[PDB]
Amino acid sequence: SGFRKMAFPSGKVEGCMVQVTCGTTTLNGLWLDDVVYCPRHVICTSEDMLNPNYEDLLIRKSNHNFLVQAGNVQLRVIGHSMQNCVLKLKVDTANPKTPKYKFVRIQPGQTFSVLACYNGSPSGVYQCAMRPNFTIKGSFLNGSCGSVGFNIDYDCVSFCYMHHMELPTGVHAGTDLEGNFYGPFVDRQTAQAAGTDTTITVNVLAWLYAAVINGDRWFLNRFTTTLNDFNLVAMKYNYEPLTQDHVDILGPLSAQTGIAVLDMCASLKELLQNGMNGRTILGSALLEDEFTPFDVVRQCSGVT
Amino acid sequence: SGFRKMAFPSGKVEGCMVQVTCGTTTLNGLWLDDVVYCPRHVICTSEDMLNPNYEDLLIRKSNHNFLVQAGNVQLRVIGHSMQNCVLKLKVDTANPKTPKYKFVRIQPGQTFSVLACYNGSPSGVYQCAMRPNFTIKGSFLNGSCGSVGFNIDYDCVSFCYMHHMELPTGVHAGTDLEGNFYGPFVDRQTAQAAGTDTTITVNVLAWLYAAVINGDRWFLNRFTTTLNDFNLVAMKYNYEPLTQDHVDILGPLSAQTGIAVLDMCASLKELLQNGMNGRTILGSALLEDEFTPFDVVRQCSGVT
Ligand SMILES: O=C(Nc1cccnc1)NC1(Cc2ccccc2)CCOCC1
Ligand SMILES: O=C(Nc1cccnc1)NC1(Cc2ccccc2)CCOCC1
Numbered sequence: 001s002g003f004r005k006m007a008f009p010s011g012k013v014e015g016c017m018v019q020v021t022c023g024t025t026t027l028n029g030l031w032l033d034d035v036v037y038c039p040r041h042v043i044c045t046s047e048d049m050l051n052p053n054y055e056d057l058l059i060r061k062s063n064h065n066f067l068v069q070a071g072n073v074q075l076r077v078i079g080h081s082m083q084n085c086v087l088k089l090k091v092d093t094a095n096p097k098t099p100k101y102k103f104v105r106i107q108p109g110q111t112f113s114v115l116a117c118y119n120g121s122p123s124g125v126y127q128c129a130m131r132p133n134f135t136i137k138g139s140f141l142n143g144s145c146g147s148v149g150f151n152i153d154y155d156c157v158s159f160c161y162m163h164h165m166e167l168p169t170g171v172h173a174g175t176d177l178e179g180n181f182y183g184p185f186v187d188r189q190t191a192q193a194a195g196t197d198t199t200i201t202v203n204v205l206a207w208l209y210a211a212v213i214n215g216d217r218w219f220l221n222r223f224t225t226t227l228n229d230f231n232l233v234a235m236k237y238n239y240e241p242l243t244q245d246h247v248d249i250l251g252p253l254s255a256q257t258g259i260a261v262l263d264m265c266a267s268l269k270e271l272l273q274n275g276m277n278g279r280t281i282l283g284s285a286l287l288e289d290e291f292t293p294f295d296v297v298r299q300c301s302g303v304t
Numbered sequence: 305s306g307f308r309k310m311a312f313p314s315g316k317v318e319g320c321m322v323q324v325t326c327g328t329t330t331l332n333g334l335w336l337d338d339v340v341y342c343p344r345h346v347i348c349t350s351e352d353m354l355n356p357n358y359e360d361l362l363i364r365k366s367n368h369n370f371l372v373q374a375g376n377v378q379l380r381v382i383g384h385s386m387q388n389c390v391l392k393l394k395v396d397t398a399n400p401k402t403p404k405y406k407f408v409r410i411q412p413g414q415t416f417s418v419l420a421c422y423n424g425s426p427s428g429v430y431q432c433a434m435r436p437n438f439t440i441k442g443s444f445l446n447g448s449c450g451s452v453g454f455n456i457d458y459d460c461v462s463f464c465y466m467h468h469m470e471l472p473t474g475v476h477a478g479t480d481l482e483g484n485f486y487g488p489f490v491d492r493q494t495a496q497a498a499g500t501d502t503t504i505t506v507n508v509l510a511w512l513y514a515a516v517i518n519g520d521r522w523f524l525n526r527f528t529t530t531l532n533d534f535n536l537v538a539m540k541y542n543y544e545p546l547t548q549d550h551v552d553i554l555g556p557l558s559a560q561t562g563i564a565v566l567d568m569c570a571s572l573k574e575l576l577q578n579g580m581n582g583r584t585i586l587g588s589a590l591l592e593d594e595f596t597p598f599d600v601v602r603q604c605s606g607v608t
Contacts, residue, residue, distance in 0.1 A: 001443075001444075001445075002441060002442050002474060002476065003443055004430040004432070004442065005309060005430065006427075006428035006429065006443060007428060007430065008429070009427070009428065010313045010314050010315060010429065011313075011314060011318040012315075115313060116310070117608065121608035122313035122608060123602075123607060123608040124308075124311060124313065124603070125311050125312070125314065125429055126311065138306050138308065139305075139306040139307055139308035140305075140306060141605075141606045143606060170306060170518065170519060172306065275582070280590065283441065284588075284589070284590070285580075285588070286584065298427075299428070300445075301445075302427055302445045302448070304421065304422045304426060304427040
């Protein structure tokens with residue numbers, strides 16, 4: 001028993017981290033097979049970040065200008081290309097530590113682990129959710145750009161995020177591994193509006209099921225609700241509308257606990273309307289939305 | 305910016321995890337050099353766990369009864385010994401992935417990362433604190449025994465915890481790597497009282513400094529206090545008494561923020577007496593005590 005904000009073991013990803021330097025800018029890159037992936041803003045100067053023409057900036061660069069270092073060994077760059085907001089540096093050596101991997105574009109509300117890196121060296125690992133507004137609330141300092149987010153299914157690492165920037169609001173924006181930003185963000189030092197964020201309703205319900213499995217049951221009540229009634233409450237409290245697809249994904253947890261999804265919705269409704277009255281659930285005094293129904297099943301079943 | 309409950313990158317530890325089987329019991333072991341360390345309760349049956357005589361149980365076992373598997377390769381056991389509550393299985397092969405390592409006994413209030421494992425395979429990583437009462441609030445299921453806690457200083461892994469059991473209260477107990485339990489616990493299926501736990505005051509103050517560094521400042525007030533006055537409040541709210549040693553360790557954070565430690569104590573005093581009035585600090589609606597002053601400096605400075 002016990003329920004923690006658990007990240008995937010980061011070993012397979014640590015073996016892919018490298019340092020990429022271009023001019024005076026140093027950030028992190030991801031070395032998979034004979035390609036190193038990194039944010040294209042590695043080619044920017046301080047005057048450039050305000051409004052960069054990446055095409056023109058990249059033209060002034062040659063293969064020998066990209067310094068890629070894996071630990072203490074230097075990699076030889078034999079090609080460079082820009083794909084959306086990522087640079088792909090072809091190297092003459094395939095990473096011997098390349099795990100089985102996929103590049104995936106995750107959906108808002110899904111979770112992943114981040115391996116925060118500086119100068120190509122791993123500093124820490126944490127689990128987070130892609131917010132409904134396509135930002136992530138991470139922990140990143142200057143130099144963390146190029147750190148990646150991922151999920152692991154047995155031996156396969158699905159890379160889903162590469163860190164690009166911190167918005168003036170302190171939240172984080174980045175791309176999939178094809179260099180496409182999540183959300184409306186652009187890789188420019190300009191004020192950028194992150195949309196209105198909402199709470200990931202299906203994740204809060206999944207976490208309420210995790211609480212019941214672990215003995216925290218005080219919030220269970222004698223009530224039920226309907227999807228329509230619950231969604232009137234969700235709208236008022238800036239929660240994502242619950243759909244039948246969300247109910248369907250909660251099926252295994254509803255089956256394990258014997259608590260019908262709409263009954264758990266009625267507990268959530270009362271928690272939204274009345275608050276927690278100074279009580280806690282799984283060591284939290286707020287409703288947690290960073291665990292998906294899959295995370296709850298995985299953590300509660302011990303998937304390795 | 306941003307502040308997360310960050311674990312150490314687990315790669316160096318993943319390379320040490322093995323599966324240990326004895327009779328019908330399977331748990332995790334830690335393979336360092338030519339020794340595999342695991343909880344001695346791997347030699348227990350179901351009738352034995354209620355009141356085991358480990359000395360007698362181990363006498364009925366031979367080197368060939370301990371099945372140690374690293375991934376898919378079988379290790380050859382050439383010696384076995386019990387040291388306190390851990391079994392040390394000498395193998396004929398030194399682990400090629402053995403990192404630089406130390407065995408350390410951590411103090412209550414200190415933090416560490418846990419790599420939860422099942423059948424010798426890593427499932428996830430999370431950061432936690434050794435509670436003042438020597439329990440840990442982890443996430444462990446049956447089969448997780450032998451999973452370890454550790455800290456990393458550049459290339460050196462300091463192993464500080466090995467998981468042994470879950471108390472009837474759902475909290476976790478284990479040993480240092482010399483097999484000495486943290487706390488009064490014994491490796492027996494019997495009701496065991498964990499002492500009264502307290503909140504780790506120095507960690508809450510460190511986390512309040514992290515909040516200020518990251519822009520969460522609403523809790524800062526126009527007041528100050530004394531160590532004596534603050535400790536009267538800490539006693540009432542079951543917080544650990546703050547000492548000058550704790551003030552001294554908060555020195556760098558006090559210096560970085562320009563907020564005197566006793567002034568931060570006065571903010572904490574008001575938060576204890578008045579609550580958070582429905583507000584949050586670093587995304588939490590309660591006072592967080594799982595970050596040490598060292599963790600806050602490390603996370604805020606990007607130590608890799
Ligand atoms: O976003 C970060 N820092 C960072 C800090 C903390 C967390 N995450 C990132 N760095 C900048 C990246 C950038 C953006 C667009 C074009 C060119 C470069 C933006 C700010 O100015 C310095 C470069
Ligand atoms: O503690 C765990 N399970 C577990 C589950 C979840 C989290 N952590 C551990 N397992 C037992 C270990 C034990 C203790 C003392 C002597 C002999 C063996 C105790 C309960 O009965 C089964 C063996």
